Amino acid sequence: GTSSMADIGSTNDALDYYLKSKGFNGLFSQIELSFSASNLRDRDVLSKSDPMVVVYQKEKDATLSEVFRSEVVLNSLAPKWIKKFIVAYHFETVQTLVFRVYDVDTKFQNSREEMLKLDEQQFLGEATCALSEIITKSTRTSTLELKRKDGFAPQAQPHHGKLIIHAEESLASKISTEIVFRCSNLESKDLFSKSDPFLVVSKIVEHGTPIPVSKTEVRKNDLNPIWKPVFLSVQQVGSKDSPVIIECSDFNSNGKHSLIGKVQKSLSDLEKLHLAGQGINFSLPTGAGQNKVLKSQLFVDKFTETVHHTFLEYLASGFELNFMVAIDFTASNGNPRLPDSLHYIDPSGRLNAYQRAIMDVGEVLQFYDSDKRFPAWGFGARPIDAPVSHCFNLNGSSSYSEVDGIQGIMTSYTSALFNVSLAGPTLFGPVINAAAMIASASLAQGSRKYYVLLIITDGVITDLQETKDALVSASDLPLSILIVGVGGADFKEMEILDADKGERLESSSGRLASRDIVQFVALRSVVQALLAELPSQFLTYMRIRN
Ligand SMILES: [Mn+2]
């Protein structure tokens, strides 16, 4: 291998960071709801029924898809259903579900539930909620009153019983496999030199290039390397019986690394090797369809399937996501009273871009905080009689920034719009510090809050340096940040801040960010993808924190 200790050191440093950012990546989470009911009644009388719960998925257009259907419990005054419903959990979307309980006619006592027509059974009642509402309860159990439409009666509308939903993250979806590889007698292609070897584990595609899934650090002048542990979830590999590619390569600082050897084996195959203590010989390709078995061998020194502490594990341990908002009130935007102002409050009730982004994000994150007291700021405006503020409370107080609910944010916003003077220029430093001050204070008081600040701007920032410095400093606190650009401005300068598109942030004082905490996108939903990254950031913090 050709490279300096410095070239190696730094490619390893790049890897460490990338791993902490992707985490024990990609155990895409699944929930098991299980069901039971009490007091099922078509009218005012409770007698043995034959209950069945049926679960629909509510689309935004309010359309209903059937996604599950319990078995029929026979002759019961309180059924406890055996059949569980496994639904995927998507942190980035509200998953509205609708539950419907039916009293199955007795003539069907021998029918498989799949075969039942619901028109032919007694509809007892219905309830609705988001998945988010069930998995954020301490007991992970909700109790919902089944209701029917009796015509029109929000108060004295009769009950038809209670439906009781228990949610549990499914064990299989929490499993990752730690592996420690070791090789034996590696030969570099570069003759008369020792190898600087690393390993790449790649999922197999059919008729296209294999997708790298994991990578070991590079070791200097080692012919019998024992790497640090790499971790693999089942979704990264496919199934435990799915063959993967393991390539051993010789590192070259010039970026073109040379293949040392390659084997193809499943994660199951590796386990058998581990237990047996046996190694397997590597191969190189030679003839466009033949391979050569090397003297060099691969070994699996360690191999442990573990239950990884997942996002949902933390939520069930009483950890919250607390939403914060900061809104550009720079004149960039145009007078609120102008139809083509980005802050125009349409009389018809149509949301502007700031309202859209607030809802798109808040609507989801509101379920992960129990108090729903959300700090709300504006920046770049002149309040009555004062100079320009770069962090004033939207609610218009002097002492506190919290507002009640998304609703509270929306009314604080429309309120501020007509009680201050859009000014300038566009600065992010002060709000980020304000947020950090709150994060920090929460950390010191041993709270279990992690904070998500949404910043919405119409142009590019002025204080790019003092922003980096604030972010870098914030990276140690329980705080993620999402920036959303609105209107048609050129946001090119913003992309240096994005976790994905940008680069690891450097303080002016030289210090580096512990982790990626910023994302940016232009609201040309596109928000969904911003939300999808937060769990990872969330967990990164929890790993790193000290
Ligand atoms: Mn602006």
Q: What is the 3-state secondary structure (H, E, C) of 80-139?
A: ECCCCEEEECCCCCCCEEEEEEEECCHHHCCCCHHHCCHHHCEEEEEEEEEHHHHHCCCC
What spacing in Å lies between the alpha carbon of 416 and ligand 1's midpoint?
16
Q: Output the six-digit token pair for 410.
A: 């929306």
What does the alpha-carbon distance between residue 466 and residue 534 come to, in Å, rounded to a whole number?
24
**Method used to obtain the model:** X-ray
Nearest to 102 by CA among 61, 67, 71, 139: 71
Burial of 170 (0-12, 13-18, 19+ CB in 10 A): middle
What spacing in Å lies between the alpha carbon of 189 and ligand 1's midpoint?
57
**Three-state SS for 360?**
helix
What spacing in Å lies between the alpha carbon of 485 and ligand 1's midpoint?
9
Q: Output the six-digit token pair for 191.
A: 């003759």
Q: Output the six-digit token pair for 43.
A: 């009218």
What does the alpha-carbon distance between residue 427 and residue 459 come to, in Å, rounded to a whole number?
10
Q: Is 463 annotated as a binding residue?
A: no
What does the alpha-carbon distance between residue 238 and residue 240 come to, in Å, rounded to a whole number?
7
Side chain identity at 177, as an amino acid letter? Answer: T
**In 175-290, which ranges are E strands?**
175-184, 197-203, 211-215, 230-233, 243-250, 258-266, 280-285
Where is 469: in which H helix or E strand? helix 464-474
| Helix ranges, 183-320 (H) | 234-237, 267-276, 311-315
What spacing in Å lies between the alpha carbon of 414 and ligand 1's midpoint?
17
User: 150: which residues sit within 8 A by CB, 6+ positions away?
Assistant: 157, 158
Burial of 428 (0-12, 13-18, 19+ CB in 10 A): buried
CA distances from 341 to 62, 297, 347, 458 (A): 32, 67, 14, 11
What spacing in Å lies between the alpha carbon of 12 and ligand 1's midpoint?
40
What spacing in Å lies between the alpha carbon of 425 and ligand 1's midpoint?
7
Backbone angles phi, psi at 454, to 5 degrees: -110, 120
Q: Output the six-digit token pair for 60.
A: 């935004």
**Three-state SS for 420?**
strand
**With contact defined as beta carbons under 8 Å apart, do 395 and 411 qualify?**
no
What does the alpha-carbon distance between residue 384 and residue 406 come to, in Å, rounded to a whole number?
25
Within 10 A of 118 (CB to CB), how many other CB atoms are there? 14
What does the alpha-carbon distance between residue 50 and residue 328 come to, in Å, rounded to a whole number?
58
Tell how strand 51-58 and strand 64-69 pair up. antiparallel
What does the alpha-carbon distance between residue 329 and residue 335 come to, in Å, rounded to a whole number?
10
What does the alpha-carbon distance between residue 336 and residue 330 come to, in Å, rounded to a whole number?
11
What spacing in Å lies between the alpha carbon of 468 and ligand 1's midpoint?
18
**For the chain, what is the largest distance between any 2 Cα atoms, rounded to a whole number of angstroms?**
90
**With contact defined as beta carbons under 8 Å apart, do 237 and 267 qualify?**
yes
**With contact defined as beta carbons under 8 Å apart, do 219 and 198 qualify?**
yes
Where is 534: in which H helix or E strand? helix 534-544
What does the alpha-carbon distance between residue 108 and residue 111 come to, in Å, rounded to a whole number?
5
What does the alpha-carbon distance between residue 198 and residue 220 come to, in Å, rounded to a whole number?
10
What does the alpha-carbon distance between residue 210 and residue 216 come to, in Å, rounded to a whole number?
17
Within 10 A of 311 (CB to CB), how many other CB atoms are there? 22
What spacing in Å lies between the alpha carbon of 466 and ligand 1's midpoint?
17
Backbone angles phi, psi at 390, to 5 degrees: -110, 15
Side chain identity at 144, as an amino acid letter? Answer: L
What spacing in Å lies between the alpha carbon of 43 and ligand 1's midpoint?
60
User: 335: which residues sit within 8 A by CB, 6+ positions away?
Assistant: 341, 422
Kindly report the length of the chain.
Answer: 546
**Three-state SS for 225?**
coil
What spacing in Å lies between the alpha carbon of 408 and ligand 1's midpoint?
23
What spacing in Å lies between the alpha carbon of 473 and ligand 1's midpoint?
24
What does the alpha-carbon distance between residue 317 and residue 225 come to, in Å, rounded to a whole number?
40
Nearest to 353 by CA among 95, 379, 451, 361: 361
Q: Output the six-digit token pair for 499.
A: 């976790």
What spacing in Å lies between the alpha carbon of 486 and ligand 1's midpoint?
10
Domain that holds residue 47: 30-172
- End-to-end CA separation in angstroms for the chain: 37
Q: Is 105 annotated as a binding residue?
A: yes
What spacing in Å lies between the alpha carbon of 499 and ligand 1's midpoint?
22
**With contact defined as beta carbons under 8 Å apart, do 179 and 269 qualify?**
no
What spacing in Å lies between the alpha carbon of 328 and ligand 1's midpoint?
6
**Three-state SS for 491?**
coil
What spacing in Å lies between the alpha carbon of 459 and ligand 1's midpoint?
4
Nearest to 100 by CA among 19, 153, 11, 160: 160
**With contact defined as beta carbons under 8 Å apart, do 344 and 514 qualify?**
no
Backbone angles phi, psi at 223, to 5 degrees: -105, -10
Helix crossing, 405-417 with 353-365: angle to 10°? 160
Nearest to 118 by CA among 181, 65, 53: 53
Within 10 A of 383 (CB to CB), how many other CB atoms are there? 18
What spacing in Å lies between the alpha carbon of 344 and ligand 1's midpoint?
15
**With contact defined as beta carbons under 8 Å apart, do 333 and 341 qualify?**
yes
Q: Output the six-digit token pair for 491.
A: 């946001």
The sheet with strand 230-233 has its strands ordered as 211-215, 197-203, 243-250, 258-266, 280-285, 291-307, 175-184, 230-233
Q: What is the DSSP letter of 389?
A: B
What spacing in Å lies between the alpha carbon of 366 and ligand 1's midpoint?
27
**With contact defined as beta carbons under 8 Å apart, do 354 and 378 qualify?**
no
Q: Output the six-digit token pair for 538.
A: 């969330």
Nearest to 86 by CA among 35, 131, 33, 165: 33
Q: What is the CATH number of the domain that holds 155?
A: 2.60.40.150
CA distances from 195 to 54, 182, 191, 258, 522 (A): 61, 14, 9, 10, 46
Tell how strand 373-379 and strand 381-383 pair up. unpaired
Q: Output the six-digit token pair for 522.
A: 């232009």
Q: For the CA atoms of the chain, what is the radius of gyration?
A: 29
Would the CA dihedral through 352, 358, 364, 367 be positive or negative?
negative
What spacing in Å lies between the alpha carbon of 345 and ligand 1's midpoint?
18
Side chain identity at 515, as an amino acid letter? Answer: R
Q: Output the six-digit token pair for 330.
A: 């720079």
Helix crossing, 534-544 with 5-22: angle to 10°? 120
| Helix ranges, 191-321 (H) | 234-237, 267-276, 311-315
User: 97: which residues sit within 8 A by CB, 6+ positions away?
Assistant: 55, 56, 57, 58, 67, 87, 128, 129, 130, 131
